[PDB]
Amino acid sequence: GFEGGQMPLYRRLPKFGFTSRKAAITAEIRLSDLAKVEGGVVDLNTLKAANIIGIQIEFAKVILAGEVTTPVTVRGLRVTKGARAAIEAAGGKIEE
Amino acid sequence: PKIKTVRGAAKRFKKTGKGGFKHKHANLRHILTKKATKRKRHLRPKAMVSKGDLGLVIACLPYA
Amino acid sequence: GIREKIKLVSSAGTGHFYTTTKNKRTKPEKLELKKFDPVVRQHVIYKEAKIK
Amino acid sequence: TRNGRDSEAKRLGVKRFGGESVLAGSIIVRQRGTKFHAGANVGCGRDHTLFAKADGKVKFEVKGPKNRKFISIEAE
RNA sequence: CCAUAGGUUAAUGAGGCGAACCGGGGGAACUGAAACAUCUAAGUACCCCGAGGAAAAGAAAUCAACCGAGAUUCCCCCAG
RNA sequence: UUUUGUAUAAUGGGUCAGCGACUUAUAUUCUGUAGCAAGGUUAACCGAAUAGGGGAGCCGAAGGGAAACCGAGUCUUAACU
RNA sequence: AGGACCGAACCGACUAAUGAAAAAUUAGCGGAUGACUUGUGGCUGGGGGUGAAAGGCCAAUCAAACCGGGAGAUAGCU
RNA sequence: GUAACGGGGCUAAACCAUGCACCGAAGCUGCGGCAGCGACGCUUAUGCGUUGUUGGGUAGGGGAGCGUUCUGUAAGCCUG
RNA sequence: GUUUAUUAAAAACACAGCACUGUGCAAACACGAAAGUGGACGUAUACGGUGUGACGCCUCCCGGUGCCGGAAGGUUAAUU
RNA sequence: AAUCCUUGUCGGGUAAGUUCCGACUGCACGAAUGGCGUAAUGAUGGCCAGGCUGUCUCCACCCGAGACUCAGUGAAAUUGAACUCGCUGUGAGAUGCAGUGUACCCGCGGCAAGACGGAAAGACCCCGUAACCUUACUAUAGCUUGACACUGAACAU
RNA sequence: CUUUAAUGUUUGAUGUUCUAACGUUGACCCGUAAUCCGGGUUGCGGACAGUGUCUGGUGGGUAGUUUGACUGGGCGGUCUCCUCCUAAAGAGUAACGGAGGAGCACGAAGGUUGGCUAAUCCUGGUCGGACAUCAGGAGGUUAGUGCAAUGGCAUAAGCCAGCUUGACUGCGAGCGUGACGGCGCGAGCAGGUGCGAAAGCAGGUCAUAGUGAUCCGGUGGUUCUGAAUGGAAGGGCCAUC
Q: Looking at residue A85, which CATH number applies to its domain?
A: 3.100.10.10
**For residue C52, which residues of chain B lie inside 8 Å, CB to CB?**
none
Exposure pattern of B13-52 as b/e (b: 16+ CB <10 Å)?
A: bbeeeeeebebbeeebeeeeeeeeeeeeeebeeeeebeee
The residue type found at C14 is T
Q: Are B15 and B21 in contact (CB under 8 A)?
A: yes
For chain B positions 7-36, those within 8 Å of chain C (CB to CB) are 32-33
Q: Residues 6 or more apart from A66 whose CB is under 8 A from it?
A: A30, A31, A32, A33
Cβ of B2 near strand E (distance < 7 A): yes
User: Would residue C40 be called left, alpha or beta, if left means φ above 0 and alpha means ψ between -120 and 50 degrees?
Assistant: alpha
* Three-state DSSP string of C32-52: EEEEEECCCCEEEEEEEEECC
Neighbours of A43 (CB within 10 A): 16
Residue A46 maps to a domain: yes
Cα separation of C18 and D45, whole Å? 26
The residue type found at D42 is V
Q: Is A45 annotated as a binding residue?
A: no
The residue type found at A56 is Q
CA dihedral sign, ordered A11, A15, A20, A23: negative
Cα separation of D50 and D66, whole Å? 19
Cα separation of C46 and C34, whole Å? 6
Domain limits for position B36: 1-64
Resolution (A): 4.1
Cα separation of A13 and B24, whole Å? 7
Residue A88 maps to a domain: yes
Query: Do chain D and chain B touch with ≥3 beta carbon pairs under 8 Å?
Result: no
Helix (H) or strand (E) holding B47: strand B47-48
Indicate the fold that domain C1-51 takes in CATH: Rubrerythrin, domain 2 (2.20.28)
Q: What angle do CA B47, A3, B45 make, to 5 degrees?
A: 10
Chain B residue at shortest CA distance from C19:
B33
DSSP state of C12: T
Cα separation of B1 and D44, whole Å? 61
For chain A positions 25-84, those within 8 Å of chain B (CB to CB) are none
Query: Strand (E) positions, chain A?
Result: 28-29, 41-42, 61-62, 73-75, 78-79, 93-95
Residue-by-residue DSSP string for chain D = ------PPP---EESS-TT-EE-TT-EEEE-SS-SEEE-TTEEE-TT--EEESSSEEEEEEEETTTTEEEEEEEE-
CA torsion, ordered A22, A24, A29, A30, to nearest 10 deg: 120
C-alpha to C-alpha distances, C30 to B33, B35, C48, C49, C50, nearest whole angstrom: 18, 23, 6, 8, 10
Where do the structural domains in chain C lie, given as residue ranges? 1-51
Exposure pattern of D62-76 as b/e (b: 16+ CB <10 Å)?
A: eeeeeeeebbbbeee
Q: Which of B9, B11, B23 sits opposite A1 (nearest CB)?
A: B9
Cα separation of B57 and B45, whole Å? 20
Cβ of A24 near strand F (distance < 7 A): no
Per the structure, how many domains does chain B have? 1
The experimental method is cryo-EM
Per the structure, how many domains does chain A have? 1
Residue A14 maps to a domain: no
Domain limits for position A40: 21-94
